[PDB]
Design a protein around this ligand. Structure first.
Ligand SMILES: CCCCCCCCCCCCCCCCCCCC(=O)O[C@H](COC(=O)CCCCCCCCCCCCCC)COP(=O)(O)OCCN
Ligand SMILES: CCCCCCCCCCCCCCCCCCCC(=O)O[C@H](COC(=O)CCCCCCCCCCCCCC)COP(=O)(O)OCCN
Ligand SMILES: CC(=O)N[C@@H]1[C@@H](O)[C@H](O)[C@@H](CO)O[C@H]1O
Ligand SMILES: CC(=O)N[C@@H]1[C@@H](O)[C@H](O)[C@@H](CO)O[C@H]1O
Lengths: 541, 541
């Protein structure tokens, strides 16, 4: 029974020991940079193990930094709540606003009518629409939005009888069937993948954009919003299609002509007509567009286009027009939220003022969304988690440990650049797979910045592939909040998820390694050589 | 039927008209100070009218200020997490932690045992314990904690047959009768009143302390933690006691024995012994004190002690001990939160494996508090409200509103100082009566500071009484959240509460006007004479 104590109490022992075990690192060496390293290491161990609730560990810098003497208490508390975080919160709130009026259901059904009711065509349509959705909102919001539609469509096919929701016929909740697992893992993976396309979709893009633009004010290259799309989208398409093919083969016998599941998908092909009838009758059941949905759509489109035109390459941009003070992208999303609270819902009140119509509303007209709804659904804990990364970045920069570790990693000079790039990709993936993506990106990026400063490489040549690499996380439930939500709301098991995750990782390293060296040259032909403006920085350091 | 239109849809009209109607303010006068004036006025009129939800309107500065050119967008978002805010949020969290383990029940029952069980003594005991609890934590959490205890007690008395909580069946929610009205209003008023006690009682104290420290740094006086308590406590005891007496007279038949309420109280006196049996039997039912409660109590006391002495003082100032960089009071509360997450609940597991006596737990022991609980209880909206208040204060200082309005009120020098102080108190209370406290403090403090600079009057002499008075709100449900919670919990017709408000307002005004002039001179010696360091700023302006 001495083993059972280890079985049911392992989470506590790690908390008790790890600070004590790692205590000597401060004591032996002198500089407070070692104290910063101690804090970073212990916080990382808590993150990866999930001994404490994941959010609460991010609070530690508040007590740590003033005691360690690294940074003043007032500034450290200030660093959490920055404009990017406001953008992210506004995005989540407007996504809930979309969810309120059921518009996503209509969009899904319309796409289904477009594609048809064949099983593989169904899967392809869902993957593509999920990618398109997640290109421009929060990933956790995207998957939470889309999942109930998924449950509805497979329970409709349950009424059809082609598939089974749970692998066992209810024999802990029962294991889901291969088909259901395929659908849920597909939506999760596509949701995660979509972030790489656009700056706005996932916070990691914003974080390393901020880090790079902070370190080098004098960079000739710009990392512009249209150019970021031009770099990102082709690879995005290639590996999302490859992930589709791999997932289809792994679960449904796509390229295996003979399988028991192949008979199942052929049977699903047989009942195409009845599925078409249930789908188009179901669409008919929704009814014509209400106004409510119409202005929701208008606000969403306005928000996206208003992001697009903030000093773009082709256009002058409104930011230059309103050059009174520097305005970030936080303004449009909050503008949308406030208006979404202002505007009415049905406009029936207009009947009394001028119209001859009969009906008149009895009470106050409800607005688009109600604060009672917003409080319950949004995951408020994310603010601390996002703030922790900024706190760590600022602390590491001011304490100077980044310079120490960068000058420590100086032996890599002998290697040719391409193999160094491969090593960078591999280490970035390995680090990401064990925590939240934003935190890992904030840890990793500055030391590579200083490394490139030292080992005479153009910095962006490593920074951009690294930042793109930080996004993927495919085989840990704790790795990425969309994966956590998909673990919820369903009965997926960790081992099967991990073994399914082997494909997309291999695919994404291969495709980044291939397209970076080729496409970036077209995007930037100066990455290979070392520019003079960076030589000035090197001389400065 | 057009009467029904204005009766039902006025909230939309105010939103549509007021921003448009108040437009000429910026058009007629060129200075950006008037733009800031317009912003402040429209925000305030939205606040008082409650057309929009209270929280959402405070978002407006982060969109208005970057466009209007007063201050950059980055700074505005930075203001929303000044350390006082995280201190307040942590205070709410630890209050929930106390709530989780039923400590308040034990405290209330013990105090009831100490005082007695006669009706008037019962009411007095509840009032005193409510005040003592609200001494240290946020007011909304305090009243939300204390509310169901009163429900239980009145249910007990209903079982005894002394009185009925409901007024009458069918004379829409039922009307409450006198006794329950008295009890609930006592709870609300006592909570709000005792919140005035110390620095940590309510966000207004933190707000105006921070403003005073920011505007003036060379001043002799400091308003550290002990001195504020010394200035405040003697007054709060007096007006709390007088409030108790007034509530006894108005609702409970104190001095009028030839009244119907006198006979019911007399009937209550005979049955006091049976109620004593019920009370102490119920206390016996609750059982002995567990380790859980002991731990949470130790953490609470440790937190308050760290506040008391760590900051500069005669004995054992730990801030002096760790003075590499200045550390504020944010550390202890977040320390308590994270520590409260770390510790276990039972200790049976660890001790039992070594001890070998007693059952082995079959699962991991839960921590003191669970993030699921924190998710659904904290009023997360308060962050935006406090941020809006801070933003308004900073913007008014930056743009030049304060200097203009202070110079505009230059004429008030003719009146004697006591009369001026009385006018300040009266106007402060009247403005507090409309909207939330922290907003009024933010609007009022800076203009008073600049005016007192102009009139050559020691600024503390006015700023402290006004800051104390801003807490006092006793009339309308929108004025302060505890009133809303009470009115919602048991339906209260606002007419009765408004009528009952006439007592505490008069009592508080009189006792403040007397006790300031008496006690402040003792605690602060030089208030009457204008100090030289203020004259330096006077020449600076
Ligand atoms: C100068 C730099 C400063 C940096 C500061 C950074 C912030 C703070 C960092 C940490 C500081 C030390 C904190 C120590 C906390 C110990 C918690 C022990 C919890 C515990 O007993 O867990 C059990 C195993 O540990 C054990 O068996 C533990 C053995 C010892 C138990 C007795 C502990 C007594 C209390 C010690 C704290 C001081 C007094 C507080 C009143 C397993 O239990 P489980 O599996 O059920 O866990 C379920 C999850 N909770
Ligand atoms: C060159 C000058 C530049 C100046 C710049 C500075 C000033 C800028 C000011 C911007 C103000 C924007 C205001 C937008 C909202 C207007 C108010 C609408 C209120 C409303 O719906 O009222 C209804 C009653 O009818 C009414 O109140 C009757 C009027 C209805 C008007 C409808 C307007 C529709 C606008 C277009 C909407 C669709 C497109 C959106 C992009 C419902 O009132 P209620 O009380 O029942 O409900 C209240 C919510 N629960
Ligand atoms: C302040 C600074 O960095 N100036 C440099 C300048 O010396 C250099 O000639 C030019 C070309 O890269 O880039 C820029
Ligand atoms: C503000 C400044 O530059 N110097 C002041 C000095 O005028 C004043 O006499 C002294 C008293 O505290 O504080 C310092």
């Amino acid at each position: 029974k001495c083993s059972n104590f280890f079985a049911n109490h392992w989470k506590g022992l790690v908390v008790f020991l790890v600070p004590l075990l790692c205590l000597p690192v401060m004591l032996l060496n002198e500089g407070a940079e070692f104290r910063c390293m101690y804090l970073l290491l212990v916080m990382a161990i808590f993150w990866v193990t999930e001994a404490l609730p994941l959010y609460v560990t991010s609070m530690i810098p508040i007590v740590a930094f003033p005691i360690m003497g690294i940074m003043s208490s007032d500034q450290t508390c200030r660093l959490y709540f920055k404009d990017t975080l406001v953008m992210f919160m506004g995005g989540i709130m407007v996504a809930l606003a979309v969810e309120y009026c059921n518009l996503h259901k209509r969009l899904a059904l319309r796409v289904i009518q477009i594609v048809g009711c064949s099983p593989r065509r169904l899967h392809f349509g869902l993957i593509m629409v999920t990618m398109f959705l997640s290109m421009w909102i929060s990933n956790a919001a995207c998957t939470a939005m889309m999942c109930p539609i998924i449950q509805a469509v497979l329970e409709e096919l349950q009424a059809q009888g082609v598939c089974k929701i749970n692998h066992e016929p209810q024999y802990e909740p029962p294991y889901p069937t291969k088909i259901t697992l395929c659908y849920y893992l597909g939506i999760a993976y596509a949701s995660s993948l979509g972030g790489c396309g656009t700056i706005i979709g996932t916070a990691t893009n914003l974080t390393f954009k901020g880090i790079y633009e902070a370190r080098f004010k004098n960079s000739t290259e710009q990392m512009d919003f249209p150019t970021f799309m031009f770099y990102s989208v082709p690879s995005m398409l290639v590996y999302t299609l490859l992930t589709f093919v791999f997932l289809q083969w792994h679960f449904m016998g796509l390229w295996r002509p003979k399988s028991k599941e192949a008979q199942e998908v052929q049977r699903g092909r047989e009942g195409a007509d009845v599925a078409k009838k249930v789908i188009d009758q179901r669409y008919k059941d929704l009814g014509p567009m209400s106004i409510h949905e119409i202005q929701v759509m208008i606000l969403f489109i306005f928000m996206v286009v208003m992001y697009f035109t903030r000093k773009p390459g082709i256009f002058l941009g409104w930011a230059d027009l309103l050059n009174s003070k520097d305005i970030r992208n936080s303004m449009p999303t909050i503008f949308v939220v406030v208006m979404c609270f202002m505007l009415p819902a049905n406009y029936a009140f207009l009947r009394y003022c001028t119209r001859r119509g009969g009906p008149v509303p009895t009470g106050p007209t409800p607005s688009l969304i109600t604060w009672k709804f917003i409080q319950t659904k949004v995951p408020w804990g994310l603010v601390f988690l996002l703030g922790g990364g900024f706190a760590l970045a600022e602390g590491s920069k001011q304490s100077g440990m980044a310079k120490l570790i960068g000058n420590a990693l100086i032996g890599l000079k002998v290697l040719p650049n391409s193999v160094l790039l491969l090593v960078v990709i591999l280490v970035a993936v390995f680090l990401t797979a064990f925590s939240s993506n934003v935190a890992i990106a904030n840890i990793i990026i500055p030391v590579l910045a200083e490394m490139s400063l030292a080992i005479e490489i153009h910095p962006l040549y490593l920074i951009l592939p690294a930042g793109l690499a930080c996004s993927m996380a495919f085989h840990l439930p704790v790795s990425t909040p969309p994966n956590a939500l998909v673990a919820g709301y369903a009965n997926i098991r960790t081992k099967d998820m991990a073994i399914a995750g082997i494909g997309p990782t291999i695919i994404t390293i291969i495709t980044l390694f291939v397209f970076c060296q080729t496409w970036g040259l077209v995007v930037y032909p100066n990455l290979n050589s070392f520019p003079e403006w960076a030589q000035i920085y090197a001389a400065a350091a």
